[PDB]
Symmetry: C3
Subunit: 398 residues, 3 copies
């Protein structure tokens, strides 16, 4: 009968669905289809935000969704969610997704095959936050090749450290809810390492149109990170939703001060995105009133984080870092403060909490991951893209 | 254990999810994310329909989603869905959403926190049907301030009267399914009171693109107003869907008569919207064949309701009234006729019915709400926006 | 109590929801709203792909959604899903959808009313793959009339043969999962019979924007064809997803060979669509590794199937045939090879399998349907559109 290892059993002998709640499954099923639409969210958002462009990266978002898919089929999933992995990376147990079916996943409440589906949507949103930085006059052929390799040696380590069975941040005692680390910091600082070595209407709608796609999709992103149809799912959604509100209102007032009384529509659009990123690691852990702080604080810190566009000049890919890499860090910190064991308990999840319940040690744990993440995302991103220009016919930039 | 008041219990002592069906919850969770995309539906639809514009209100739709969020966080939810409210308005019991978690809501079949999530999406669609009327050369700063106040003293009373615990239309005996009153009539007649005191391709796609967003989202709007995963949910969806069909076919034939044989693509787009609004208050109460009538009738009555664009001239915000304010009334009336106690009974809902089962008195009850609504939405909208121009530096229009 | 015929019982005497899983229902409910957005997917995709156009068929997609709705209300549903049908067509038992409520449908695991909702979304996507071929300087009035008749005598027979109670392909032993036959082949070869008798940026985004809508929506299309919240739903989604990946990667490499090293963004967009169509009939039956083949093979065969644009010249509607009619056939064949009884068994579905388990006879059965389909879709499409130009005032083309 139910073995809990491999495919979990004989389809001819046992009903593998009996292990799971069909409502928890239905939700993550929905949630899966919602994260995907965040890809042309990045595309439209960063296409429309570019002040300089080689190729409409709204189309180059579809390029990532084919590449990320095949890598994640190939060995991507295995390296993050295998049941026998080390502690730094998983195994290759599931190469080309064989024996991925009915066993409970590293989230015990959905099967491997739906958790492959839903977690596969984060390596793909990461992919377009990556290609999106290095789009300017970059070659197309080697680009795809970059990504495949980058997902393998940069994303997958970080992901297994955060979400993976015997990962070392899970076991340390660090909280990361919907993956600010694996997705925003990973891609915020690997976009920095492109803009150091390989470094207005008629395009406003494309930001906005693009912005809206992301706001919409994050509901599947955060709300479906609870892993079940429970009411913490919907809780995190109330949180997500208003970090994005207070995020975007804050960011509009701030340059309306710093710059006389400057009109800024693209302001509010980014304030939202500043707040969504800022709440990712905390959406299922922090009290609702405190999720306004997660709106405010990363909008401010990221506003000034953009004004570092002139005291070092460079532009191609600092927009990604300005929001996701900073805003992730800011939010991964703030988790350590407001993470409350009594919000976590709404689906029974046991954590020690953060400062909200005098678990002082937590805020340290939180700094442990962000630094490990940022570093790995920078050095190992760096080694590959230098060694990538090294060979002529596999370009990157010109 | 389960107390049914406050947060409903101790997360450390009881499992608060046991009260609810995880499938009813999953659905309204989905449905919630579907109503949201109706906001840039209005935006794109009314931006693209404007014959005259100050600022792309497709972006000014995102402004409403930040403001509506914070107001609804602040005191919005409390005023409509508090468990101890008077009969004209709820209490302030839930200021800044404290003690909103696991108790059954005024819809007993979902928790306060998911019902905050899903019902919060109607105050936000209302918000953009509001700002959307008064967009023309209006100031941005005071605009946000308008809305906040308008949601508080105009929307929230009407909403608590229709949906609220001890509201007086619920207790009277009036049927309103997905809220034609609180959302369309409220915003149809408050858009009239702007165009009295403060009163083509290359923009066709934006109507269409915008139209499509709404048709798509209404499924979450109406279908998720049943409050459960029951098969009345999907019933109302079959209704919604074809009121929009027959709505839009009717509206295309009609000016194809009145105007020689005039081509009208924007016709069909509005006929749909005419029919969606016309079925909102009735989608869960009326037999499917009768939902064609709800397509037809409000398309006609609203077609002529547009031709009042010349026998009084004014334009800025009559498009909103032409569809949602008239079409709501037309549909709130027609509910009283075709509301059938044996459709309501598909999830066990007990009503007296409408004329379909000789409950003659009903059609009166239906007129009681629409008039109360329309009036409150007009007078109290009026007092504020006059007293709003009154002070210089908090403008509205110029 | 539960009678299983008619409306299934007395709403006042029995709870009709008890027959069904509220999670299976919730999903197909969601899935229903996902297939709909595939309509402006076709629209945007084929509008943006047109090298020649009379009227933005992105708006002419909304025309189909009104017409398809009313026909399917009228007699459409009845002809395909009636419980007493012959073997060639169902009955008229459910004319104007009376007595469609709580009985299990021809898929026993959802009620007639939700199965009307969800299956109604395929006759509508078919509708826009139809009108979309014959859009070029065609008249609008008679167009609607065409469709209504075409859905009735062409779509509905094919559909009842594949999905219908006593259909003859179901009973024969043929596998068709999400309906490559009824939807793609039906509309691939009926688009051929228009282009025989009645026969670049600034429009790239519209392909892409349009492409994305379809990729997104297919999850509801294929994943919701399992009919339940089971984990085969999500399985088929993993399949769908990567047939579209490997589909679109293949198609980009291929003209990057055939044409020197030609840049082709519209390539990848179509490769995806080539792969989605290629996996439709197989998504719930074939092993995941084999779903890469379904990506590759129909991308190649359909690439060359486009290069028949010059060795016969004609264009208006060969793009539809190039993808859906060929790609359907290619995929309906390949089902017969890789259909495995042990994937089908994941929700207990009993099939004999295909060649994967030495059921040699299968591949024949598979050819039986595709040919029957293609033929009926051609001859009967032909008779009507010739006899349609026959009468002056009901034009088609000029």
């Amino acid at each position: 009968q139910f073995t809990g290892t491999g495919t979990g059993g004989d389809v001819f002998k046992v009903d593998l669905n009996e292990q799971f709640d069909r409502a928890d499954m239905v939700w993550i099923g929905t949630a899966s289809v919602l994260v995907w639409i965040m890809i042309p969210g990045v595309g439209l958002l960063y296409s429309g935000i570019s002040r300089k462009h080689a190729l409409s990266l709204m189309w180059a978002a579809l390029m990532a969704a084919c590449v990320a898919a095949f890598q994640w089929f190939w060995w991507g999933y295995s390296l993050v969610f295998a049941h026998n992995g080390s502690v730094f990376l998983g195994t290759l147990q599931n190469f080309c997704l064989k024996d991925v079916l009915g066993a409970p996943s590293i989230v015990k409440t959905v099967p491997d095959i739906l958790f492959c589906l839903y977690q596969g949507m984060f390596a793909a949103v990461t992919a377009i936050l990556m290609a999106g930085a290095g789009c300017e006059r970059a070659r197309l052929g080697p680009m795809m090749v970059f990504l495949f390799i980058w997902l393998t040696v940069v994303y997958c380590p970080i992901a297994y450290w955060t979400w993976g069975g015997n990962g070392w941040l899970v076991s340390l005692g660090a909280l990361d809810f919907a993956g600010g680390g694996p997705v925003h910091e990973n891609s915020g600082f690997a976009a920095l390492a492109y803009s150091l070595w390989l470094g207005k209407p008629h395009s406003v709608s494309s930001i906005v149109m693009g912005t809206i796609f992301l706001w919409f999709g994050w509901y599947g992103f955060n709300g479906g990170s609870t892993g079940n149809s429970s009411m913490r799912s919907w809780y995190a959604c109330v949180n997500t939703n208003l970090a994005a509100a207070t995020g975007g209102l804050t960011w509009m007032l701030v340059d309306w001060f710093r710059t006389g009384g400057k009109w800024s529509t693209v302001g509010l659009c980014m304030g939202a995105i500043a707040g969504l990123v800022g709440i990712t690691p905390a959406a299922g852990y922090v009290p609702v009133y405190t999720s306004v702080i997660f709106g405010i604080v990363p909008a401010i810190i990221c506003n000034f984080a953009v004004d570092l566009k002139d005291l070092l000049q460079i532009d191609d890919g600092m927009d990604v870092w300005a929001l996701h890499g900073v805003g992730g860090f800011v939010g991964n910190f703030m988790t350590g403060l407001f993470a409350a064991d009594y919000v976590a308990m709404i689906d029974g999840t046991e954590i020690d909490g953060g400062w909200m319940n005098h678990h002082w040690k937590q805020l340290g744990y939180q700094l442990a991951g962000s630094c490990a993440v940022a570093a790995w995302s920078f050095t190992v991103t760096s080694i590959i893209l230098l060694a990538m220009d090294r060979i002529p016919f596999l370009r990157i930039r010109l």
